[model samples]
Target: MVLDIQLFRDETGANIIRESQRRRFADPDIVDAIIEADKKWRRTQFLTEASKKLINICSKAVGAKKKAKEADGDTSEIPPQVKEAYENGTLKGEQVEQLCVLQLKQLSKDLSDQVAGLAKEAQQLEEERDKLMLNVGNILHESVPIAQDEETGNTVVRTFGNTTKRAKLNHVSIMERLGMMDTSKAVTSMAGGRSYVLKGGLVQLQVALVSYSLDFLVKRGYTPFYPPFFLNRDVMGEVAQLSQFDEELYQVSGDKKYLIATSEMPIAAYHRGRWFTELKEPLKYAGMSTCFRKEALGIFRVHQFDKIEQFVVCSPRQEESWRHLEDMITTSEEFNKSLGLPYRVVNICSGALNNAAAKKYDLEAWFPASGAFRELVSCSNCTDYQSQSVNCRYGPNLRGTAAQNVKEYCHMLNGTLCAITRTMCCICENYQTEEGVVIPDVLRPYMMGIEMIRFE
Candidate 1:
């Protein structure tokens, strides 16, 4: 499928720009640039094609004139040797014809020059159009709330679990007290302040969390797959994550691949340039991978971690796609609730949305230790946005005639089931006591039948 260049030509495109202002997506000038580039591409294409046709007409007229002149005994234009060779049938017809067209040589040169110039202009316009189109992000979902920034615009959709009435120690302090994490040695091991080593029960707890989270999604119809931890530059761009690579991702030295910040990048690209013959059911996947981030200095915002990600590709129909988005969010919330973690679901402000997502929801677990809510999972509905980039489509547009049937872009959605490292921090702080950290009941089977992580 070709890029949706028509997006620049319609009222739908204008509405996208209008909404983008509210969402504060990139520069609104990019919208104007795309439309302007589209105009230039069309205008230049018409001029170049028209020039080519005119050149063809002129060249043919000149050939006809040369033939008539030759038939009329005007042989002055032909060289004596070339004419002799033509009579002897030693030289090809084209060579003799070229000699005949000597009278129109200047006309041919002028027409060829014009065609070449117009063709070059058309090529330039096409490149300009493509670059501008890539700069434009997806249309904002209609249901998205208007906001200038995250702090002023975030809306709390729901809160779950009981709030603690007592004071809480920070997760770092609690982990240190219980011999769960060793940041001092991590600093000495070439990782600096941004690193930590989980010891004893915390290590076991981390594994238990991953196992439990993967199982949670698997039971709910998500097919499990382990994706690569890094992706090539072009593949990452198809998933719309390459723009953040310099700031958010770590590229491998002496290679074109970059470490993935989340499995979402590869999962979204899994069906690149693919067609869906049957779209009665959404394609759902549970991907668990090691994620890396070049975030600031905090364990909560570390260099490397593991995560369980849920992703879906579904029909373009809003009802069908939106349901999958809600389902993903609910699954994340339920997963957190099962772990007995206090959390709140926030409708992500427009400014907070990445380029691919139309609307997003974030589940921020209550970090009692920090006495603040921190994002644990993010869920998004990227309606046709990512599909447009990857050339993924759901086919057989049944509303039209057989000959008129066309493929339509599918919608993409993703959510986190558990960011194990962050969740561990929450558990450590929330369940800490003088004796030990209590393990959630849901993790007991995965945690070797242990009820608590205690220090001897």
Candidate 2:
């Protein structure tokens, strides 16, 4: 799928490949393979194009010969003077007889054969070039730190609120005490292991979380999109999720469709193979979807969860992506504060980034009972990496009278507006009590004016 043919120009391609190797992003030997394939493709392309030009020239000569023959009076037979004149461009039509039509026809056929043979070779070389290019990855930002893993490389930007001294209860205990979540039942009724059924207040809390997050983004002019949960294999690959992390996603039975791992998958895939004119202003969307993942923990890392995701497609302007990344991360902090939860933001290391993002941030929430910060939200500035893979492009209108604009891949960024299950878990642990669960003040209006959820 790594078919960016333009990358193999000058020395830029080799430099990029070397950088990726130095950063341990890709296999080093792939660089030479790509270079060789590119060279072959270029050589074949020139040969193919030259052959096409010759065919065009021969066709034009054939047209001239026919016209000269027709003007010569006898359409069936050649006049020697007219035949000579036709070759020299001195005759428009036969004076009285046809000439040189047979010769011109044979010459055109030969040229066409040459063009066809060369074109076939060019096509084969292009396929080889694409296969070789598949190993190459997007260029990393110069600022990205070279680290082996998140533990060694990650840097916490800042912690938001102080950890409290109150007697803390883990989310599992709190939810079970409230009689709102049933993991054992989920194992029986739903797909077994790593699954849960959230009922009553817990279910309502998840809804409240999504509603609040949606309203927050809506006020900030983010359009709401409810995209399909099922995507075909080709679209999944185009989004660059399937090929790399196939084990994390689920494929539907007897069809090309696959269950999405996140709303980001469908939201990003929505613009696959599309071109846009004038993306100076970023296109933003708040996508809410039921996401599935094959995770590790029961209930915490379950098969299905609801999430409201923040996605943006914008121009390749650096200022625009930086602004959006800051806005999303800050908004996440603000949202956490509204729930009275302690949190921290960490700059995710380059080694931690999946192939798409040049840089990423993970907002970790303090789980008091666990006595640790848990990753609750992730924000990424993918720049043009994702859009390039998906073929989402933008430029000034080519048909317009304005100066011709160079088509460019747009930047793509995504962040967790609110992940229902995790945020709900945070809220349950942070706002629990012996009497009941204290719903966050911001969510009161959405929860039918209920200030507290009590187990009777």
Candidate 3:
């Protein structure tokens, strides 16, 4: 949000640099349109003013003719000069009124058409901004330390502070030995598909993780909200970046709703059309919602669903938003590090920006079996581009000579604190061993100081 961009106040080759108020960079079409709109607005405003001026002039002229007739003292009969002048003045007035009316109507219609056209173009430009966001995501993911090559083995970005490595055994092996994740039952009950059921400890661990995270965020200043599970078709299309990802996103049957992939949509829309007082500053919040996504990892992972979400709102102008993003990342890092898990922070590239983010950073945690840092948390700095379309604003700052009443749009930003399923995967895979799994140190004080998570 504290970025200086390549944009200007006016659409000229002058290269006059100024801080960009508009996050959705005015592209060629928007530039041409807004430029043309400005031009049309000026002309129309002029016509409207001109028409009003003519009306006032004619009224005053009529008043003067009446006054002149009275001054000429023609009480009994009308004077020839005065009568002729009155007739000529009336004829000119009528002609001016007709012309003014025609001009006003024409200008008003042009202005309306231009406004609608501009809005549609702005919507399309948002679509383009979404693409840019996805590109940023992909780029970051690709640079992640967990290598996905045959020779490189594991891509470990960096190890967290003084962490003990888990035993050779992975979480799936531990869970399977305990009959926790019964793959056979999964196939039979869920019908021969990839299904993961969290048994005793795993289930408890997942719940504990979310509870802890929620508590942590609340302490740090975040209002929690439970967002809607499904979004209407039109709504998703407007916010969602890629149509190609729709296959990965779940949709409803017999209704035009899509099972939400995340709670970001509702958080983005919650205060629609409403402005906050002092909202030019930071507005922070967290969301807890279950997410459903069709898995492409394999048949074994199909029909998997989980819950966890975080939504942080802030002004586009504040560095606190970015700091909040870092804080989220660091908090997750510290938690995993305490658990003796290793994670690396990867700078997101342009490719990942295609979906929902403008710039992203992924904290990839080390998974022993995969011997790679699997992505555990993704944080994004979305700036005010979201607020402009959703019409989120803060109270205006009025200055001297201006009416005390002024209004301005506020900037908004959002990100994920922790994803339950992914965090579970991160902890289980990294902290598991031949003897038992160790709970992260930060969680120990809460879990009664039971460092090792082991059972029969």
Candidate 4:
């Protein structure tokens, strides 16, 4: 759904898509393979269609001939076997008609078989073509920074507050010292790697972070939702970045369902297969759920965590999506400021942008321990990428009755307002003191008037 092959009919338009990969520095041959596969699908599709029409015509003709012979004793058309039998006096008029009808039945079945075979081939070609397209990223924004090298790849756009380096206490040490978290049994117990248990103040802190963030978005007029934490392959396939799908998503062994990688997956799927005559401007959503990730080798990595995700749907206009994109990022920025955490916003480089985002912005919170900023939020304008995959359509021309009448896919965007684990680390490390961790002024009321998380 990320790409509509209909537009690829214009090789000129296809070149534009190809150029996007050049900027990504991805495999050019992959795009060409899709184009070639599409050509094969188009070829077989037409042939299969023509064969179907022939079947209908031949079937109708057989019916008319049979009716004529039975009602009027007419034998204008006859098979050779029927003719020989009649001339040799071995068959009667009805017998001759029986042989002719049998011949027509064979003709009908043969043509249909050919159509069926051709149809299957066309279906396979299309499947392969789509498989390739799903891996291709959304077209890049013109302003996206270029160059494929990893370090110094992205460009920082804005910064807030003082980001000066300072003496620091690591998050783990701060949490353990305050009795706010326990990390000892996580890796050795039933819980797998990159896992930790929240205790005492940490529990209230996570609750406050998630709950306050939900209220934050609600006050901003975004609809709040608690969605399913798991998804089937069909829906997940559309929402996941396929290149990392297997590596990232946790698959349930018995039922084969996947734990959602983010609330964004289930929330985006809320509009799956939806069609509307027109959109009522932007439909914004605030979804909170426990998210899962399968693999990680970094210090900030975790197997499971809670997150509040912001998803927006609007008309498929780049400007509208861009406007909503900015609004989503600003909403998170506001929250970061409220939390009293210094952070910076950066534009994701072309090679770094995921398959679904035309453009992306990352909001990173300052971690005093490393004297560096760690990415805490990502806002993206996915254009029609996810919408096409899920078939969420909305436009003035969309009649809601036919596919051809639907002119556009709803533009979709998602940003992280809160990822509880990482945000907790930022808070604990940034607000750490010799005696305890100072609860931010905004989160105190939610945490039972606790001013500091101290060891009792």
Q: What is the lDDT of candidate 2?
A: 0.73
Angstrom error at residue 149, model 2? 1.6
The prediction achieving the highest lDDT against the true structure is 4
TM-score computed on alpha carbons, candidate 3: 0.64
Each model's lDDT: 0.75, 0.73, 0.53, 0.79
lDDT of 4 at 376: 96
User: RMSD, each candidate, Å?
Assistant: 7.4, 6.3, 9.6, 6.1
- For each candidate, how many residue pairs have backbone atoms clashing (under 3 Å)? 0, 9, 30, 0
What is candidate 2's CA lDDT for residue 356?
A: 69
User: Compared with the true structure, what per-residue lDDT tens digits does model 1 show for residues 315-393?
Assistant: 8864687888888999999999899999999987777777777789999988776888889999998888788878887
Candidate 4 wrongly placed segments (more than 4 Å): 70-100, 253-255, 296-299, 397-406
RMSD of 1: 7.4
lDDT of 4 at 146: 92
Q: Which regions of candidate 2 deviate over 4 angstroms?
A: 1-3, 55-135, 164-168, 185-190, 242-245, 253-255, 295-298, 399-407
120-141 per-residue lDDT for model 3 (tens digits) = 6555644454343332221122
Stretches > 4 Å off in candidate 1: 1-3, 22-27, 47-131, 185-188, 241-243, 296-298, 397-407
